[PDB]
C-alpha cells in the first residue's frame, strides 16, 4: 500500500487470510503471486474488535434513528495542536 499506509485502519476494514508455509508461500513468495494466490479466509475475521472513532446517527424528520454507521480511526496519536500555523520554514540552512 502506497498512500497513508500507516493510517489504513481508517480507510479500510481488513479481512484476514490464512497463509500456510510452504503451500501458499515459499522462498519465491506467494505461490502464484500476490494477486492470484489462493488463500483461505481466516475463521478469526469474526473475532476482530470493532471500536468506531465516531458513529453517524441518521434520523428522519421525526427525530427517530434510521441507521447507525461506523467510522474507524487510523490508530495514530493526535495534535496537539496545529503544526502548520506554528512552524517556521528555516531561512538559514544550518
Amino acid at each position: 500500500p502506497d498512500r497513508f499506509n500507516n493510517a489504513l485502519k481508517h480507510f479500510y476494514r481488513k479481512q484476514y487470510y490464512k497463509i500456510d508455509y510452504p503451500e501458499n508461500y515459499s522462498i519465491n513468495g506467494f505461490v502464484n503471486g500476490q494477486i492470484n494466490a489462493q488463500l483461505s479466509l481466516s475463521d478469526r475475521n469474526q473475532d476482530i474488535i470493532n471500536k468506531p472513532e465516531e458513529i453517524i446517527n441518521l434520523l428522519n424528520g421525526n427525530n427517530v434513528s434510521l441507521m447507525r454507521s461506523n467510522i474507524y480511526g487510523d490508530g495514530l496519536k493526535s495534535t496537539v495542536d496545529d503544526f502548520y500555523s506554528n512552524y517556521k520554514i528555516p531561512y538559514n540552512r544550518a
Binding site: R3, F11, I35, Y84, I89, Y91
Partner: protein, 647 residues
C-alpha cells in the same frame, strides 16, 4: 414475468446479460471539461456516496461546482510563518565586486526559500486535501465491492437453485458450475476496471484542487513576500555609500524578483506522484497479455518462452527449428510430427470473457484439405483455425451446437500475413483482420458457451509453416490497434522481398514494378548497348532478367533502409547497372563505373522498395518502342517508384 429458467441454455442467456449489464453499470464514465482540463468521471459516484446527489445528475453538478465540491472541509490552509527579511548593515559600504557577489548569495538563498515554501504548501495539500480524496477513493472502491458482492450472490443463488431442483443433465450442471466460476472472475476483472476509474478520476480531482485552490493561495503569499523583499532590497541599495548612482540602478535591477521566480507548478509532476513501484507492478501483473510468445537461438539451443508474466506453461517438440521472420525468430513447424502447446486457465474461455488472438503466419501452401492449425477444443466446444483451400477457416462452437464457420480467402501464398481475431462479449462482436484489412465483422450474439480446455494447441497439420509473435489477450482488439501493431513491427529497418522475407545481398531475385506486378524486368539492346524494360508483348520471349544486390561491405548480409547498393545481373558475364545521360538504366561491363544507389521503402507498403541516385528516384518510363524503360526521373506518378524483388 418470464417462465422460470429450466434449460442450461436459458441459464447462460441469463448469466451473460447479467454480466454485460453489470459491466455497463460499473465501468460507466463520462469525460468532462474542468478548470484544469478533461477528466474521466465515474458516472455513478454521486448515487453511490450521496455526493452532489441532490441533483438529477451528479456529472453536470460536478462539472458546475468543480473538484473542491466533493469534500467536506474546504479551507484548511495555514499561511506559514516566515523569517523576515533584513539585509546586514555591514555591507552598506562595500565595494561593487564584493557587494555584487554577496547579493548573489542572498539571491540564491531566497529562491531556495521560495521552493521550501511551495513544498510546505504541497505537504498541506496532501495532508489536508488529498487525504479527503483518498477517503472518497476508498469508500467508492468499497461501494464497488459491495455491489459486486450483491451480483455474485444473485448469480450464486440462481446456480445453486438450478442445481438444487431442475431436470438439467448432471453433466450439464457440471459445465454450468465450471463456466459460472469463469464468469465470476470476469466480473472481478470488470470491477477492477471500475476501481481504476475511481482512482484516476479522484486523483485528477485532487490535483485540480491543488491548481485551482491551494496553488493560488501560494501565489498570493509569494507576491506579498517578494514585494516586501523587493522593497527592502531597493531601500538597502540606495543606502549604499561606496557605490555610485549608475551602479545602484544596475544592482537593483540584478536583484529584483518577479512572479516567474516562484511559479513552480508542474502538472506532470503532480501526476507522477501516484506512479509508484506498486502502481507499476500492478499494471504489469494485470495487463491484457495472457500469452506472448518469444523465441531466440542460443548456442546449441533454441529458446521458446512466454513473456506475458502469467501462468502459461509451454510444451513443445525438442527439434522445432527457428527462422528469422518479420521482426524476430519464427517457429518452423514441419507439418508432420511437430507441435507446440500453451496452457493457461484463461484459455478455456467460457460464456462471458473476451479475447484476441494474433500472430504472423507464413504457409508453404500445398493441399486444400481442412487441417488443424491452432485452437482450443474440448468436448467439441471452443475455437479452431484451420487451413482450408487457399485460405484459413475460423471456427467457433458452443455447447449448444451453435457455430461460426468463416472462410478467410487467399492466405497461403507463401507470404507472411498478420492474423488478428477479436472476440468481444460486451458488444457481441467478432472481428477478423488479415494484415491491414478487416476481413470479417460479425455478430456473435448467437454463440453462448465456448468453454474449452486450458490448452491451446498449435499443430499445423499437413502444412509446414512459420509462426511468429503469437499472442493471446483477455480483451478485444480495435482497428487502430491492429494497424499500429502491424506497421510498428514492420519497420525495423529491413527491406523485404515480394514475400516480406528480408531482402538479402548476393541472392538472386527477379525485379517487378508495383504497377505491372506480373511483368518482370527484362534486358534489351538498342545501339550496341543494353537497357532494362518490361514485356508488354505477351510472350515476346524476353527472358526474365536475374538480379543480385551487392554491398561495399563483404560482411553485410541483409538489406536495410538507406543502404548503398550495387545492382548486378547474370547474362553471359556479370553486368552492373549504370545511369545514362538520358536517365535510362543500362547494364554495363565494368563494376567501377557501376552507380551506387540508395535503397529504401515505404512504411505502408510492406513487400516493396524504392531506389534513388543523387535524390533522383527510379521508375518506369512512358511507352516507347513499345517498351517501358527503367529511368531515373522524379516527375512520374508515385506508384511507379515502388518495386519488389521476387525469389
Amino acid at each position: 414475468d418470464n417462465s422460470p429458467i429450466d434449460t442450461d441454455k436459458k441459464y447462460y442467456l441469463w448469466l451473460r446479460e447479467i454480466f454485460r449489464n453489470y459491466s455497463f453499470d460499473i465501468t460507466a464514465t463520462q469525460e468532462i471539461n474542468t478548470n484544469c482540463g478533461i477528466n474521466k468521471v465515474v458516472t455513478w459516484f454521486g448515487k453511490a456516496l450521496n455526493i452532489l446527489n441532490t441533483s438529477d445528475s451528479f456529472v453536470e453538478e460536478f462539472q458546475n461546482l468543480g473538484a473542491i465540491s466533493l469534500i467536506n472541509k474546504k479551507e484548511n490552509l495555514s499561511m506559514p510563518i516566515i523569517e523576515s527579511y533584513e539585509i546586514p548593515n555591514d555591507m552598506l559600504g562595500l565595494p561593487l565586486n564584493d557587494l555584487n557577489e554577496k547579493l548573489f548569495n542572498i539571491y540564491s538563498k531566497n529562491t531556495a526559500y521560495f521552493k521550501k515554501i511551495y513544498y510546505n504548501f504541497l505537504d498541506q495539500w496532501w495532508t489536508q486535501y488529498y487525504s479527503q480524496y483518498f477517503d472518497l477513493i476508498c469508500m467508492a472502491k468499497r461501494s464497488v465491492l459491495a455491489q459486486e458482492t450483491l451480483i455474485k450472490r444473485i448469480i450464486q443463488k440462481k446456480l445453486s437453485y438450478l442445481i438444487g431442483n431442475s431436470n438439467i443433465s448432471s453433466d450439464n450442471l457440471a459445465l454450468m458450475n465450471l463456466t459460472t466460476t469463469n464468469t465470476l472472475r470476469d466480473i472481478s476483472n470488470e470491477s477492477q476496471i471500475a476501481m481504476n476509474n475511481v482512482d484516476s478520476f479522484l486523483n485528477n480531482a485532487a490535483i485540480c484542487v491543488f491548481e485551482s485552490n491551494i496553488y493560488p493561495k501560494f501565489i498570493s503569499f509569494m507576491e506579498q513576500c517578494i514585494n516586501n523583499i523587493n522593497i527592502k532590497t531597493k531601500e538597502f541599495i540606495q543606502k549604499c555609500t561606496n557605490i555610485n548612482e549608475d551602479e545602484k540602478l544596475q544592482l537593483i535591477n540584478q536583484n529584483v524578483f518577479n512572479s516567474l521566480d516562484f511559479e513552480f507548478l508542474n502538472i506532470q509532476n503532480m501526476k507522477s506522484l501516484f506512479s509508484s513501484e506498486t502502481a507499476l507492478l500492478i499494471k504489469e501483473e494485470t495487463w491484457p497479455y495472457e500469452l506472448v510468445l518469444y523465441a531466440f537461438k542460443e548456442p546449441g539451443n533454441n529458446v521458446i518462452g512466454d513473456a506475458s508474466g502469467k501462468n502459461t506453461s509451454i510444451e513443445y517438440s525438442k527439434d522445432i527449428g527457428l527462422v528469422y521472420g518479420i521482426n524476430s525468430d519464427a517457429l518452423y513447424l514441419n507439418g508432420s510430427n511437430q507441435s507446440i502447446s500453451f496452457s493457461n486457465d484463461f484459455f478455456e474461455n467460457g460464456l462471458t470473457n473476451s479475447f484476441s488472438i494474433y500472430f504472423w503466419l507464413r504457409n508453404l501452401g500445398k493441399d486444400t484439405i481442412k487441417s488443424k492449425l491452432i485452437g482450443s477444443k474440448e468436448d467439441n466446444c471452443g475455437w479452431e483455425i484451420y487451413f482450408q483451400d487457399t485460405g484459413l477457416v475460423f471456427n467457433m462452437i458452443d455447447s449448444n451446437g451453435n457455430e461460426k464457420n468463416i472462410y478467410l480467402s487467399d492466405v497461403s501464398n507463401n507470404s507472411w500475413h498478420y492474423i488478428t481475431i477479436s472476440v468481444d462479449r460486451l458488444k457481441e462482436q467478432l472481428l477478423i483482420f488479415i494484415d491491414d484489412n478487416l476481413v470479417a465483422n460479425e455478430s456473435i450474439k448467437e454463440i453462448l458457451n465456448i468453454y474449452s480446455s486450458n490448452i491451446i494447441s498449435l499443430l499445423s497439420e499437413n502444412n509446414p509453416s512459420y509462426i511468429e509473435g503469437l499472442t493471446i489477450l483477455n480483451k478485444p482488439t480495435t482497428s487502430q490497434e491492429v494497424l499500429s501493431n502491424y506497421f510498428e513491427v514492420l519497420n525495423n529497418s529491413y527491406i523485404r522481398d515480394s514475400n516480406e522475407e528480408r531482402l538479402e545481398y548476393n541472392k538472386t531475385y527477379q525485379l517487378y514494378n508495383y504497377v505491372f506486378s506480373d511483368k518482370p524486368i527484362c534486358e534489351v539492346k538498342q545501339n550496341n548497348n543494353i537497357y532494362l524494360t518490361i514485356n508488354n508483348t505477351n510472350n515476346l520471349n524476353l527472358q526474365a532478367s536475374k538480379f543480385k544486390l551487392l554491398s561495399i561491405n563483404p560482411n553485410k548480409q541483409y538489406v536495410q533502409k538507406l543502404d548503398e547498393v550495387i545492382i548486378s545481373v547474370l547474362d553471359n558475364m556479370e553486368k552492373y547497372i549504370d545511369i545514362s545521360e538520358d536517365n535510362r538504366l543500362q547494364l554495363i561491363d565494368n563494376k567501377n563505373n557501376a552507380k551506387k544507389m540508395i535503397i529504401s521503402n515505404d512504411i505502408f507498403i510492406s513487400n516493396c522498395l524504392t531506389l534513388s541516385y543523387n535524390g533522383k528516384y527510379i521508375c518506369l518510363s512512358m511507352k516507347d518502342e513499345n517498351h517501358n524503360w527503367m529511368i531515373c526521373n522524379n516527375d512520374m506518378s508515385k506508384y511507379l517508384y515502388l518495386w519488389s524483388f521476387k525469389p
